[PDB]
Amino acid sequence: TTFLIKHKASGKFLHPYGGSSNPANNTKLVLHSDIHERMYFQFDVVDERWGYIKHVASGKIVHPYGGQANPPNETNMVLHQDRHDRALFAMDFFNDNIMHKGGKYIHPKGGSPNPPNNTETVIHGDKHAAMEFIFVSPKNKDKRVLVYA
Amino acid sequence: TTFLIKHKASGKFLHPYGGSSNPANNTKLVLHSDIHERMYFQFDVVDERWGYIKHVASGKIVHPYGGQANPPNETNMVLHQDRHDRALFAMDFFNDNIMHKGGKYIHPKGGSPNPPNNTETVIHGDKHAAMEFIFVSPKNKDKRVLVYA
């Protein structure tokens, strides 16, 4: 299933910075209001809840920058071609968040619930309204879709 | 994906009472320690998180007894052939519970962390450790499996 990753508080979406169909390794993931095919994602299940968040246009996947098992708070989120266990996430569509395998979550950098376009995303352990995400149809940004298959 | 519905606190599983491959309509769902193919379940997605909990051997699905949209606390869980929107559940594998469409949960009747064999299951709105369930492989009762596809 292809989906948009929608920041719940702002309605902005997860994007590769610059909107490339082929972002370079370590391109930052940002929040931006635009909708286009280069911000579509899919989820590739690896182990039950855990899997890779794949940028459809390029096939690169979401990573914490540097590929640590337990990235510290404020580590940037990026795209990278590599597949390994430090690129595992769970798409928690019940609590509305995205959790890295090390137990922290994807956040807007600095915690704003209404961040401007091109705000970077980071890892952070906190849970609050401004780190919530929902996973929606490319054809209807208000319609949740099931990312697991 | 076929799975066992495992009561987290006790390690017992959801069964049709009597363990039949073809339970009659309105057969109660109980907890029991045995494992066998007549207590395997599948989840048939209807609408994103919402779907039918299907007894594999018979094809009947889980219902609140009487098919309420908002079943009262203590309403018995049963199997029944019918399909409708009052037999929709969500398999919350993040918070480890089974939620009916009306917002209440499947519980062991009485809320024990170690219900005896053949304890009935019921609807109840409360949340606590003794209403948690996990969804595990028929080949390994400790290995969680993804029920959504």
What is the 3 state secondary structure string of A26-41? CEEEEEECCCCHHHCE
Chain A environment of B93 (Cβ under 8 Å): 48-49, 94
Resolution in Å, one decimal place:
1.1
Q: Helix (H, G, I), strand (E, B), or coil: what is residue A84?
A: coil
| Residues 6+ away with beta carbon under 8 Å from B96 | B8, B132, B133, B134
| Residues 6+ away with beta carbon under 8 Å from B131 | B97, B105, B106, B107, B108, B111, B124
Residue of B nearest to A146 (CA): B48
Q: Which two tokens stand for residue A111?
A: 């915690």
Residue A131 is which amino acid?
Answer: M
- Provide the phi-psi class of B101: left if phi over 0, else alpha when psi is between -120 and 50, else beta: alpha
Please indicate if any CB of chain B lies within 8 Å of the CB of A129.
no
| Residues 6+ away with beta carbon under 8 Å from B63 | B77, B78, B79, B80, B82, B86, B87
Residue A146 is which amino acid?
Answer: L
- Provide the phi-psi class of A57: left if phi over 0, else alpha when psi is between -120 and 50, else beta: alpha
Instruction: Give CA–CA dist A135/B92, Å, rounded.
Output: 16
The experimental technique used to determine this model is: X-ray
- Provide the phi-psi class of B56: left if phi over 0, else alpha when psi is between -120 and 50, else beta: alpha
Looking at the domain covering A1-149, what would its CATH class be? mainly beta
Pairwise CB contact (< 8 Å): B45 & A92: no
Residue numbers in the known binding site of B are 15, 18, 26, 34-36, 63, 66, 74, 82-84, 107, 110, 118, 126-128
Pairwise CB contact (< 8 Å): B45 & A144: no
Residue numbers in the known binding site of A are 15, 18, 26, 34-36, 63, 66, 74, 82-84, 107, 110, 118, 126-128
| Residues 6+ away with beta carbon under 8 Å from A128 | A111
Pairwise CB contact (< 8 Å): A48 & B144: yes
Instruction: Give CA–CA dist B64/B88, Å, rounded.
Output: 10
